[PDB]
Amino acid sequence: MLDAFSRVVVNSDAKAAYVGGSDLQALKSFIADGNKRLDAVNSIVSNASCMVSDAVSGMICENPGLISPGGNCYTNRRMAACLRDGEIILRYVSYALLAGDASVLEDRCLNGLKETYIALGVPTNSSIRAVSIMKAQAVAFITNTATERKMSFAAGDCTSLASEVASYFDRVGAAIS
Amino acid sequence: MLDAFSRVVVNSDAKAAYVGGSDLQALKSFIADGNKRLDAVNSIVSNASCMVSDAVSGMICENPGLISPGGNCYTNRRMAACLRDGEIILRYVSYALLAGDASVLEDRCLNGLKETYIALGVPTNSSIRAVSIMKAQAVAFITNTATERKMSFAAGDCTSLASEVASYFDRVGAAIS
Amino acid sequence: GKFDHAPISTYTSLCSYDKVNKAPQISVTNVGSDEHSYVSVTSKYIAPDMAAAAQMLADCQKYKAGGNAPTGKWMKYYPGTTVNMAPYISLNDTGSDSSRTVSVTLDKVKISPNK
Ligand SMILES: *C(=C)C1=C(C)[C@@H](Cc2[nH]c(/C=C3N=C(/C=C4\NC(=O)[C@H](C)[C@H]4[C@@H](*)C)C(C)=C\3CCC(=O)O)c(CCC(=O)O)c2C)NC1=O
Ligand SMILES: *C(=C)C1=C(C)[C@@H](Cc2[nH]c(/C=C3N=C(/C=C4\NC(=O)[C@H](C)[C@H]4[C@@H](*)C)C(C)=C\3CCC(=O)O)c(CCC(=O)O)c2C)NC1=O
Ligand SMILES: *[C@@H](C)[C@H]1/C(=C/C2=NC(=C\c3[nH]c(C[C@H]4NC(=O)C(C=C)=C4C)c(C)c3CCC(=O)O)/C(CCC(=O)O)=C2C)NC(=O)[C@@H]1C
Ligand SMILES: *[C@@H](C)[C@H]1/C(=C/C2=NC(=C\c3[nH]c(C[C@H]4NC(=O)C(C=C)=C4C)c(C)c3CCC(=O)O)/C(CCC(=O)O)=C2C)NC(=O)[C@@H]1C
Ligand SMILES: *[C@@H](C)[C@H]1/C(=C/C2=NC(=C\c3[nH]c(C[C@H]4NC(=O)C(C=C)=C4C)c(C)c3CCC(=O)O)/C(CCC(=O)O)=C2C)NC(=O)[C@@H]1C
Ligand SMILES: *[C@H](C)[C@H]1/C(=C/C2=NC(=C\c3[nH]c(C[C@H]4NC(=O)C(C=C)=C4C)c(C)c3CCC(=O)O)/C(CCC(=O)O)=C2C)NC(=O)[C@@H]1C
């Protein structure tokens, strides 16, 4: 069934699909610690709005030139587009966790991101700062160590997935370096 | 009595349905979590007017080509038709929450809908944007996390119902893709 | 208030003409008395409101004249409509093991003006 999700992602147009309980068990047999993995993905997407805005503002917080006149987050329209880019990256990381394979992140998101930003003039060194913030954000939620929110989960250890998401974030920086 | 509700929604001879004080608690006895579920449908149906117009409007600003000449929501006549479609779809999924089953949603509404839009030329990409906004609106109201309005309820957890509404809206998207 | 509905043949897959556009109409009424509160359900015909739909186009003109997006020869990396598209995922933990569901759907990403 995971191929069907891949067929949804790759089809080059808006498309939807879902998992039923019968087919869900096929996924549960296929995945290693699927109980943890699905809870982990929920922990990101359930707070993705909080994560992205803080990281982009955190980038602005340490680098105030980005909001100075002519800056790439100056005037509303550039500011929204940066938030948009943060979301898309974070979403593509989330599916990479769900599939447990980094291919979709590279082939659909990271490919051409280097060439794209330079032609747009996006400062890539600061883009790394925002992504590296989300990696700090994402690890805390999966380990349920966030300061201002604690989640409800069945007891147990989620260390491996926390390391797994870490590699996916680090792929982003290397592509745009 | 809950059976009577299912009959009218498939257009049987009756004008309307009703449940009395004794019968309402009888219905609540049959449907587990009745009180919260009644609260949940009430929050959606009472805000359906705001939900659809905002969802339609969001769809347009995400792709203004719909209102350009040759666009499917250009003209006054077609724009009314599209607004109607969102109202119909929201009503059906709101009922599915009331019964807690997708059967009427799948059986009375979604079968044959894909072919009809193909015949009518309704662009499937724009529709998925419309449907996905209804989901985001609905989960917010059920969890009382709408940015602009707070409703009064007894405090508690409605996460299960909110994700249950999420399943229904996902079904509409898969059918129309 | 006359409206020119589409040909019957274009929706034969969906439903018969005498039942199309009828959708549930639900009213739920709270009162402190469990002996007096009630629920009501019916199917009604939802007609198109030209007056509201005229208003909708007037409001949406603002977006029509704010450009769309930049473009360049780098567009080859976004071959379909996938420019600014990302996968959306939904997860449903609930009180029944069969009712659990998951979703994944490719879709456009945009930030509402309130954020
Ligand atoms: C300037 C004033 C500046 C920023 C603005 C802001 C950016 C920033 N935030 C962190 C650490 C975290 N922020 C997180 C986000 C949230 N935590 C919550 O509970 C809510 C739901 C959510 C939305 C606000 C998270 C999860 C973290 C990680 C905490 C942890 O790992 O223990 C940082 C430091 C991390 C980094 O930069 O990589 C920064 C810079 N803080 C500022 O000072
Ligand atoms: C175009 C520029 C465009 C839109 C306009 C807008 C559409 C949009 N709205 C949301 C989120 C929500 N909108 C809601 C509607 C209302 N909230 C209320 O209190 C009243 C009753 C009602 C009518 C106005 C609600 C409840 C939500 C969810 C909670 C919230 O307040 O945000 C979205 C987000 C959907 C998504 O991310 O896909 C969108 C797109 N945004 C635009 O860009
Ligand atoms: C915050 C992270 C950055 C910031 C980002 C900006 N990106 C802008 C335009 C833009 N970004 C992309 C890539 C994006 N679309 C995709 O499909 C993919 C991968 C799936 C991603 C991640 C594109 C294609 C574009 C151009 C198309 C468009 O935006 O419609 C942008 C605005 C540029 C402009 O308005 O001219 C910004 C501000 N910029 C920064 O400085 C911080 C670090
Ligand atoms: C780190 C992310 C968390 C952690 C994760 C764990 N979840 C465990 C068990 C578990 N998970 C679910 C939900 C899951 N199963 C599904 O079918 C669905 C699909 C939508 C998902 C979201 C359930 C129902 C359970 C059972 C728990 C129970 O019986 O009470 C789990 C236990 C180990 C295991 O089952 O393999 C863990 C560690 N838990 C944490 O505390 C951290 C923060
Ligand atoms: C998620 C939906 C909400 C939430 C709602 C809750 N309401 C609870 C109790 C409750 N609700 C009603 C009204 C409801 N029952 C009826 O018979 C009628 C009539 C149609 C409806 C509209 C009642 C009467 C009650 C009982 C208490 C009272 O008299 O008001 C409730 C607790 C139920 C439980 O789990 O034991 C919840 C959670 N509350 C929230 O925080 C979210 C946002
Ligand atoms: C709005 C978000 C869309 C949009 C939708 C349009 N649909 C049009 C005609 C139409 N739609 C349906 C399906 C609808 N009727 C029902 O009874 C129920 C199911 C029970 C559904 C959900 C039908 C059957 C028809 C044809 C019947 C009729 O028009 O009387 C329509 C007008 C097409 C025309 O010009 O004739 C529109 C604009 N189009 C979009 O681009 C967005 C995404």
Numbering used by the authors:
A (entry chain C), B (entry chain B): 1 to 177
C (entry chain A): 309 to 423
The authors write:
Red algae utilise a megadalton-size light harvesting antenna called the red algal phycobilisome (PBS)—comprised of rod structures formed from stacked, hexameric protein-pigment rings emanating from a protein core that is poised above an integral membrane photosystem. We modelled these densities, identifying a new family of scaffolding proteins related to red algal phycobilisome linker proteins that possess multiple copies of a cryptophyte-α-like domain. These domains bind to, and stabilise, a conserved hydrophobic surface on phycoerythrin β, which is the same binding site for its primary partner in the red algal phycobilisome, phycoerythrin α.
The C-terminal domain of LR6 that binds PE β in P. purpureum forms a flat structure comprised of a β ribbon followed by an α helix. Structural alignment of the C-terminal domain of LR6 to published cryptophyte-α subunits produced RMSD values ranging from 0.744 Å over 172 atoms to 1.335 Å over 208 atoms. This provided the first evidence for the existence of a cryptophyte-α-like protein in the red algal PBS. Examination of the deposited cryo-EM maps confirms the structural similarity seen in the deposited model. One of these clusters is LR6, which includes a second CALM domain beyond the original model. For the unmodelled region of LR6 and most of the remaining two CaRSPs, we built de novo models including models for the metamorphic N-terminal domain of the associated PE β subunits. We hypothesise that the CALM domain originated in an early LR6 rod linker, by modification of the ancestral Pfam01383 domain, which allows it to bind to the metamorphic PE β (centre).
